[PDB]
């Protein structure tokens, strides 16, 4: 149940060093006894998911901040938490010695780690690949007779995915996203740039691209991997832009609507993988609510869409209410999902920044707002990167929660990995968000959920320099008195009955 | 046969576009009667090994530079020319349809092409792989019972080498270099960075490593391939710098010496592959004379070393006289061989420049400098690359004589390909370098060689923009009046009897 | 007078080349008889503010889009148009030989130019300086006795502003904005990064800061310049980001309010420059409605606030209706102003793209959108930049309408310059925006407005590849049949009596 | 006399942190008493120029290492040590609060710092400028009527130069170098790329460029700065290379020869600044001895050259015997001077690496070798850089002994600053190098010199892990017993009489 081993790389906080024989970890999880709460803390100063336990008192006299649970107010059920098995992530992980590979995967996927239950798999290459390739690169192969998985799947991604699922006790859901199609299906003849599918929904190009999905699933299935969902297309808006630098395939909302309706919906249904769900959008949430309007108000497309997938860059800011909120209002039965998230780049920073507390707080802060607005799940980008933040074929640099230093056979767990963990570890699939009324204006972000077994979890992130005394109230049991240290993140759990 | 189909990409000269059905090629070559010479010409302006004939007549009306063949001054015999069959070149070649594959192979290995007769083979992965593996990654296998060939070998490298050999009429020698040992023989337990073999020459580790070389040979023999030679280590000096990003394995001059004396030599000699030869260094020529002084002034080491392998990459930090020149002088019975003849060069430039005359000239100039200073052979780097210069699992940095474009089922033959060919096609194994005296100081680079059958070849690179009028005298035959245009390279051929 | 000399730099359109002796310009504009309209046209293909005339005819042959002037619907009045006299632009301008200087200035401030009537003028350094500095760098001068103007002001900015004025027939309004205070009033003792004023609104730090605005206005008064307005701080949100690289100065909405009330308002009002107005925010529209909610609901703050200044950055992150639109509603007697208009975005793009029609469109599209959501004026960023998009002491990131090449004593007028001119030349101060109803869903952006003398002016923008037939109806006059070419921007003008 | 405040940034060693109120520094220097040695040490594990003192024993009993001072073998006299006041250095330092600026300058230039006596000054912009610009950009200004210093000289470079000279006891020597001429004197008409001086030496182009040097010198003189020496040109080999990215101006050796002979030499001689020495070359030592041969074997050129300037790239390796060795041999009376040194990225390998011992070692192992082969002086590149290695207008990336953090108003002294200091501080101007023979093969790099007053210094660097015990012998005085801890650098000082 070993503790963190800290190193400062000169920024606001430390990272935790793992290596072939040592990684920080958890005792197998356990519930506190009735009358008591558990609290996990992580701070800028260096505390990393330290377990302390406390009393639920029957009394409180104001008037510090009070957060009141409203066990009555239901909201979204919760799908899960996870990240992406990008080519680069696979590569960095396999470049470490076997035993360090497992401490790596346990960190993410074990119950002794942060219990991830989602993995996003790209369908052939993205920008975290070291070459551009699709699974059907033979020109005019409308039948897809030359469709095959390269080594990047059969040797890197796929094996790693089996390993991850073995380590994990929680069932894991796989999510696929393609970035680009073969270039012979694309008006512009290249993996990138402006350009969309050739022709017209309904036609041969469109039928082929949809069969391509079934092939992807067929091929993955002979390796004993099944998918929970696919998405219609990564960042479809990206491919509508002149000079776009990585792999992509443009869709306007109309094009996407028609593609799903006339092609991808039916092709999926007629195949043995009909159970696989489909998500639309997979893009920046500012395209909302309009993108959903367009697609979903067509019953032909709607019978086919299970949910809407969104992205955010965390250095930036959207309102949320106007997007996710409004979207929920209009389509309260099509689940919002965050399918990709990540931090820049500033530009004055510096893609990987080892031990940055800021980048930690943005993850949690964005996870909180997302849960506050009906989002059922949250997927990180690359599971691992190197210290340059690659490999990337096109030099697009971003950070990752785990950083691999192949030359030292070590890997660093970043603050990000831990703010992610405050949720991933304590909110299993099934959890239902429920209400949490603040007694008054405050700087804290907080959120409450209930496990499938009635029990309670609350996450509190504090982004001020100042400490904030506070009480959480729960009617069925009482008051919890605590502090949120400035620059802290806490998770509280307690039994209710 | 078929001529070069030119495409430009906005660099100084053009590439020859080949695809599945068309590729530029040569006729079986044909040598005229006494008094007549053949001349093959390539020019920045676009000419590509264009054949033409002329007279060698008895009066001499050149009044400019004279170059006189001096067959009685005889220097080194040529082992030959080739390139490397890295993981990355096998992927790129295998991503063309079969018919385009054979035109690529015919291009290099057939006598319709440029008649390569050497292939350098990595033993397990380097940075031109898509993943970091060795042939025995299973720890504590000091007898290497789990030693085996992955799919890179058994499914990409071996079948490509078989095909190269069916195509070549000339015998082809194979040369092998390791980049790294299993990580569990290394001081640092990492595929890269600073790290040597564990312990010291003699011990269980050095013996295991030495054995790995044999296991490798055994394995390839099962696939019916024999090596001409192996190198002691690819860039042993790299393995001594902290943070080196590529696969390496460190040896000081002194350590390499003892690994050869104590371990490598005795092991090979004691094996059924004792006939395979051993090349030392495999590194930058700036490391010479020294590295040779340390290894060869010890008779236990020297007795097993046949040759000294050099890389071109650096070189501008030398020049030839101090390094190759001096090494010959000191050890005139140890042959000098260019094992990694490469540069994608100048920091402000892309890895791949399609159609760059500068880089084609860089190749030829330095084959000329190398022949004038005793070198007996040239291995280019990667047979083929994608247009990024990859795949490389780390960073791209280098060009290749052939660029493959999978999306288009086409490949491009760079000026480089032809500057190699002006030598590789007309200097069969066994050819001997012979003297060639300039009547006056000139800006051209010229070498003369004599074939085994006695017939004469001269190559004249012109790296300036001005046409140089030129005569070549063969005392046996007469005078050859000609011109070397700006930015041209000529190969002359004639019978002497 | 003289037409445009086009030059291409391999982007979608041309620049107009201008030097010491030639530069493209206009005749005094010339209003025609009733029943006749003037149209000025620019197009991606090469037309630049080309004048043609036609009839407004009482019958309506048009059958496509109809746009109908509705003079009875009246909205905001227009303050005007301009850009910033940063250090970078004063330098680029003053490195042209005098005769070329005046044609650059005529180009912007003349009525044979585009009739700028606003200049924004930083108060000491920002990033578009060559070095950092304030007007009182000598610590503990709480009375600012050692306050003075450097050469950047007294030698470059000021004289260049005098000549923009001499040249302009329209009154020109000056707007001033600080980036940072003396670093001895800051929490962090640095010209940048995270950090605010020290202590509390009310205190000696806030008092001294407020005095600095006056001391500035004093300084410029002595050079006979007077300001229309000042902003409270350039991008105040920025100073709340750790390691923000440019000169900033942090204010929370709450802190800005308090500083306006206690210090900035009284001090200006209690001074001989009581007439100068104050603009709040000067920041990304994303911060609205909130920022004005916080400042303007306090009657002590609000009585001193004339206007809310917005930046165009940081615009994709928010729709206009949610921001500008929602803000007007809430505070419909506070004007909206665009104080910094900016493009050079798309990370994978060079900062300056010579002759890019796309960036031109981004300007006009966004002036249209602004105008439809109540904005009264615009200030572009830098008046001039070098081809690097510097001088900038931090990093170059942005384009400018006029790019200066010192080495050729020439400057280029970008597509941007004309898209701005399609507005700034024909919409004098005092012009009022009026309604314009599309007969049907379309792709054009259009805005209609009414000069003080009540003549009509209409801009139409076509961000599409295809020609759009168009009729424009003035109920008072008749119909204007016309076509809006793909990738074109039109300005129409007609008498209404 | 305050000690070092250490920060780790995660690499092999610490930096010393300075700020507005605190900087590590020395006491005024002290004569050690006869009988004793002084020893300054700096270590990988964190010691920074710690003083200790010790006994000179009269006896020793050998077998370990012994290095014997040969006070009689005299070698080169020493000119000095210093760095370059680039635009980027000037501005990073002027960005700090005024008192942090003095601690910075004191560290380099004060006698309680590391004793710099050289400042190299670029003549107009180089790559560590934020805009390209010469002192005469008015096209065809052959008379040089528009020649003037821009602010970068007047407000950044010059003021600091005064301030550094005021803080230094030792006379400081200024060294000027141009990178580029006005573009209208250059065949290609650009600040960069391939291209040299128009026409032929003797002509107006050539004669103007030389007058440009006197102009530079006149203008500098108006500001009371006199120059010790000027170089004919920075990296003249650079401007002969197609597409070279920063400011350059190519010369072949003959061009340089004839430029100096026909123009630069006489022009300078005819001027009031005839006292100013002139160094040729200013480029990679690879060009040796060939470049010296060409210039100096022409009497007309040679009467004008005072010394030869060399550059080294510290990531790489040149031999030196063959370059500097020979060059001395041929021209013992024209001094050798290193005008620029720097560590790039080792290209994998960020440009600033805070706390790198390696890069520290490369400085000293370099300085020692320069010292061993006749060099009189040694000048570092940029005095100060930001953490990104800039600002650079072109992104060329290198490290610096001092990294400035403008936002924290701090600065870091890197290991490099201290390997520099071990020489700069203790080898005043006029010191003479003398012999030092090792009793036996070792790894230590060492060197010994004699102060002008008679006294001794030796420096010993240890680049192995192992500690090496050793004795230094001086005949006149006795034996010094000591260790050289692995990864350490010592300097020893003793009076002799
Ligand atoms: C791995 O980590 C543990 C804990 O820091 C440490 O004691 C050990 O030295 C490390 N092993 C290696 C190979 O560095
Ligand atoms: C290959 O190239 C030849 C000549 O350029 C051309 O005629 C033919 O169309 C090409 N083959 C294909 C399949 O494009
Ligand atoms: C200025 O531009 C005009 C038109 O391009 C041209 O006729 C003239 O040569 C230019 N002037 C100079 C000094 O180059
Ligand atoms: C800078 O100097 C010392 C060094 O540790 C420190 O105690 C002091 O507080 C620092 N000053 C600032 C402004 O941080």
Distance D22 CA to ligand 4 centre (A): 6
Least Cα separation, residue A351 to chain D (angstroms): 12
Give the burial class of A240: count Cβ atoms within 10 A of its Cβ; 0-12 exposed, 13-18 middle, 19 or more buried.
middle
Interface with chain A: mutation pick from C242, C294, C349, C398, highest number of A CBs within 10 Å = C242
Residue with token string 């370099």: D366
Residue nearest to atom 3 of ligand 4 (CA): D22
> Which tokens in the block code for residue B220?
């390839």
Asked whether the beta carbons of residue B188 and residue A95 sit closer than 8 angstroms, the reply is no
d(CA C337, CA C379): 8
Candidates A21, A103, A407, A410: which one to mutate for ligand 1, based on the most atoms within 8 Å of Cβ? A21
The method of structure determination was X-ray
Asked if residue A444 lies in contact with residue A470, where contact means CB atoms within 8 angstroms, the answer is yes
| Number of residues that make up chain B | 497
Distance B67 CA to ligand 3 centre (A): 53
Number of H helices, E strands in chain C: 12, 21
Which chains share 3+ C-beta pairs under 8 angstroms with D? A, B, C
Give contacts of C189 with chain D, Cβ < 8 Å.
20, 97, 409
Degrees to nearest 5, angle at CA A17 with A11 and A21: 175
Bridge-based pairing of strands D445-450 and D432-438 is: antiparallel
Angle between helix axes B158-167 and B98-109 (nearest 10 degrees) is 60
For residue B19, the ligand 2 atom closest to its alpha carbon is 1
Residue of D nearest to C187 (CA): D408
Nearest Cα residue to B377 out of B117, B86, B106, B113: B117
d(CA B113, CA B117): 12
Residue of B nearest to A407 (CA): B193
d(CA A117, CA A427): 11
Q: What is the enclosing helix (H) or strand (E) of D220?
A: helix D204-222
First CA to last CA across chain D, in angstroms? 28
Least Cα separation, residue A87 to chain D (angstroms): 21
Distance D161 CA to ligand 2 centre (A): 67
* Cβ-based neighbours of C164, under 8 Å, separated by 6 or more: C85, C105, C108, C109, C116, C119, C172
Q: Would you list the DSSP string of C97-140?
A: -HHHHHHHHHHHHSTTTT---EEEEEES--TTSSS---S--SSS
Q: What is the enclosing helix (H) or strand (E) of B40?
A: strand B36-43
For residue C189, the ligand 4 atom closest to its alpha carbon is 13
Task: Name D413's bridge partners.
Answer: D16, D402
Q: Do chains B and C touch (3 or more CB pairs under 8 A)?
A: no
Q: Which long-range contacts (CB under 8 A, 24 or more apart) does B435-441 make?
A: B435/B69, B435/B70, B435/B71, B435/B72, B435/B73, B435/B74, B435/B75, B436/B67, B436/B68, B436/B69, B436/B70, B437/B67, B437/B68, B437/B70, B438/B65, B438/B66, B438/B67, B439/B65, B439/B66, B439/B67, B439/B68, B440/B65, B440/B66
The hierarchical CATH code for the domain A5-30+78-431 is: 3.20.20.80
- Domain boundaries of chain B, sorted by first residue: 5-30+78-431, 35-77+432-497
Angle between helix axes C158-167 and C87-94 (nearest 10 degrees) is 70
> Which tokens in the block code for residue D77?
């006299």
- Phi/psi at B105 (nearest 5 deg)? -60, -50
d(CA D309, CA D336): 6
Q: What is the enclosing helix (H) or strand (E) of B292?
A: helix B290-296
d(CA D175, CA D177): 7
Q: Please report which residue ranges of A31-154 form alpha helices under DSSP H.
A: 87-94, 98-109, 151
* Cβ-based neighbours of B409, under 8 Å, separated by 6 or more: A138, A139, B19, B20, B96, B97, B100
d(CA C353, CA C9): 8
* Cβ-based neighbours of D139, under 8 Å, separated by 6 or more: C407, C408, C409, D182, D184
Give the burial class of B454: count Cβ atoms within 10 A of its Cβ; 0-12 exposed, 13-18 middle, 19 or more buried.
exposed
| Number of residues that make up chain D | 497
Q: How many CA atoms lie within 13 A of A65 on its CB side?
A: 19
Nearest Cα residue to A447 out of A370, A390, A386: A370
> Which tokens in the block code for residue A116?
């991830």
d(CA B111, CA B108): 8
Cα D129–chain centre separation? 19
Q: From the CB of C19, is ligand 3 less than 6 Å away? A: yes
A222 counts as catalytic: no
Sheet (strand C410-413) strand order? C6-8, C14-18, C410-413, C402-405
d(CA C446, CA C129): 37
Please say whether the dihedral angle defined by the alpha carbons of residues D459, D461, D467 and D469, taken in this order, is positive or negative.
negative
Nearest Cα residue to D295 out of D341, D339, D249, D264: D264
Q: How large is the C-alpha radius of gyration of chain D? A: 23
Bridge-based pairing of strands D80-84 and D65-77 is: unpaired
Asked if residue C40 lies in contact with residue C427, where contact means CB atoms within 8 angstroms, the answer is no
Asked if residue D445 lies in contact with residue D460, where contact means CB atoms within 8 angstroms, the answer is yes
C235 counts as catalytic: yes
Give the burial class of D61: count Cβ atoms within 10 A of its Cβ; 0-12 exposed, 13-18 middle, 19 or more buried.
exposed
Residue with token string 């060329």: D396
> Which tokens in the block code for residue B459?
């190559």
Of D97, D130, D183, the CB nearest to C183: D97
- Phi/psi at B268 (nearest 5 deg)? -65, -45
Catalytic residue selected from A152, A233, A235, A429: A235
d(CA A297, CA D436): 89
3 state SS of A31: coil
Of A243, A244, A348, the CB nearest to C245: A348
Give the burial class of D446: count Cβ atoms within 10 A of its Cβ; 0-12 exposed, 13-18 middle, 19 or more buried.
buried
d(CA D396, CA B347): 10
Asked if residue D334 lies in contact with residue D308, where contact means CB atoms within 8 angstroms, the answer is yes
Catalytic residue selected from A112, A152, A233, A340: A340
Residue with token string 């007053």: D453
3 state SS of A298: coil
3 state SS of A14: strand
Q: What is the enclosing helix (H) or strand (E) of D382?
A: strand D375-382
Give contacts of D152 with chain C, Cβ < 8 Å.
130
Asked if residue D67 lies in contact with residue D473, where contact means CB atoms within 8 angstroms, the answer is yes
Q: Do chains D and C touch (3 or more CB pairs under 8 A)?
A: yes
Interface with chain B: mutation pick from A19, A95, A130, highest number of B CBs within 10 Å = A130
Give the burial class of C441: count Cβ atoms within 10 A of its Cβ; 0-12 exposed, 13-18 middle, 19 or more buried.
exposed
CB pairs under 8 A between C and D: 76
Cα A398–chain centre separation? 15
Give the burial class of D489: count Cβ atoms within 10 A of its Cβ; 0-12 exposed, 13-18 middle, 19 or more buried.
buried
**Interchain contact A27–B (C-beta under 8 A):** no
Asked if residue D83 lies in contact with residue D105, where contact means CB atoms within 8 angstroms, the answer is no
Pick the CATH number of D35-77+432-497 from 2.40.40.20, 3.40.50.10800, 2.60.40.1180, 3.30.830.10: 2.60.40.1180
**Interchain contact C132–D (C-beta under 8 A):** yes
Asked if residue C376 lies in contact with residue C336, where contact means CB atoms within 8 angstroms, the answer is yes
Cα separations in angstroms, A265 against A123, A142, C259: 18, 19, 58
Asked whether the beta carbons of residue A407 and residue B95 sit closer than 8 angstroms, the reply is no
> Which tokens in the block code for residue D378?
């040694």
* Cβ-based neighbours of A329, under 8 Å, separated by 6 or more: none
Which chains share 3+ C-beta pairs under 8 angstroms with B? A, D
d(CA D70, CA D484): 21
**Interchain contact C395–A (C-beta under 8 A):** yes
Residue of A nearest to B385 (CA): A131
Catalytic residue selected from C235, C254, C349, C388: C235
- Give the start-end residues of each E strand in B192-276: 229-231
Q: Would you list the DSSP string of C251-295?
A: --HHHHHHHIIIIIHHHHHTSTTTTSEEEEEEEEGGGTTHHHHHH
Bridge-based pairing of strands A488-494 and D432-438 is: unpaired
First CA to last CA across chain C, in angstroms? 28
- Give the start-end residues of each E strand in B46-132: 50-55, 65-77, 80-84, 118-123
Query: How many other CB atoms are found less than 10 A from the CB of residue D68?
Result: 17
d(CA B60, CA B170): 37
d(CA C316, CA C339): 17
Give contacts of D322 with chain B, Cβ < 8 Å.
322
């Amino acid at each position: 149940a070993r503790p963190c081993i800290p190193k400062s790389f000169g920024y606001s906080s430390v990272v935790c060093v793992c290596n072939a024989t040592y990684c920080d970890s958890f005792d197998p999880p356990t519930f506190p006894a009735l009358g008591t709460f558990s609290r996990y803390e992580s701070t800028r100063s260096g505390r990393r998911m330290e377990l302390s336990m406390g009393p639920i008192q029957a009394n409180h006299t104001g008037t510090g901040l009070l957060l009141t649970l409203q066990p009555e107010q239901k909201f979204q059920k919760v799908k899960g938490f996870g990240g992406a098995m990008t080519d680069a992530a696979a590569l960095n992980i396999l470049a470490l010695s076997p035993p360090a590979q497992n401490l790596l995967l346990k960190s993410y996927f074990s119950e002794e780690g942060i219990g991830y239950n989602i993995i996003r798999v790209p369908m052939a290459s993205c920008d975290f690949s070291i070459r551009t390739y699709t699974y059907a690169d033979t020109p005019d192969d409308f039948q897809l007779h030359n469709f095959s998985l390269p080594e990047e799947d059969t040797k890197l991604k796929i094996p790693l995915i089996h390993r991850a699922l073995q380590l994990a006790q929680r069932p894991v859901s796989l999510l696929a996203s393609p970035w680009t199609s073969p270039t012979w299906l694309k008006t512009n003849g290249a993996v990138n740039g402006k350009g969309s599918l050739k022709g017209q929904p309904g036609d041969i190009y469109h039928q082929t691209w949809a069969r391509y999905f079934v092939k992807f699933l067929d091929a993955y299935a002979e390796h004993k991997l099944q998918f929970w969902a696919v998405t219609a297309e990564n960042e479809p808006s990206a491919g509508l832009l002149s000079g776009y630098p990585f792999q992509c395939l443009g869709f306007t909302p109309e094009h996407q609507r028609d593609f799903i309706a006339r092609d991808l919906g039916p092709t999926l249904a007629n195949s043995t993988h009909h159970n696989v769900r489909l998500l639309m959008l997979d893009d920046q949430r500012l395209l909302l609510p309009h993108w959903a309007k367009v697609v979903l108000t067509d019953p032909e497309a709607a019978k086919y869409v299970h949910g809407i997938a969104v992205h955010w860059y965390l250095d930036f800011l959207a309102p949320a209410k106007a997007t996710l909120g409004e979207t929920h209002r209009l389509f309260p039965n099509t689940m919002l999902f965050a399918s990709e998230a990540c931090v820049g780049s500033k530009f004055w920073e510096q893609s990987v920044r080892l031990g940055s507390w800021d980048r930690g707080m943005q993850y949690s802060h964005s996870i909180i707002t997302n849960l506050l607005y009906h989002v059922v799940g949250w997927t990180d980008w690359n599971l691992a990167l190197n210290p340059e933040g690659g490999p990337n074929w096109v030099r697009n640099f971003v950070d990752s929660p785990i950083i691999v230093d192949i030359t030292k056979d070590t890997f660093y767990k970043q603050p990000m990995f831990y703010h992610l963990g405050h949720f991933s570890k304590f909110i299993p699939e099934g959890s239902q968000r429920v209400g949490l009324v603040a007694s008054q204006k405050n700087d804290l972000d907080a959120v409450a959920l209930m496990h499938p077994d009635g029990s309670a979890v609350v996450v509190v992130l504090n982004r001020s320099s100042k400490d904030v005394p506070l009480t959480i109230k729960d009617p069925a049991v009482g008051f919890l008195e605590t502090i949120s240290p400035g620059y802290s993140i806490h998770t509280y759990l307690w039994h209710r009955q």
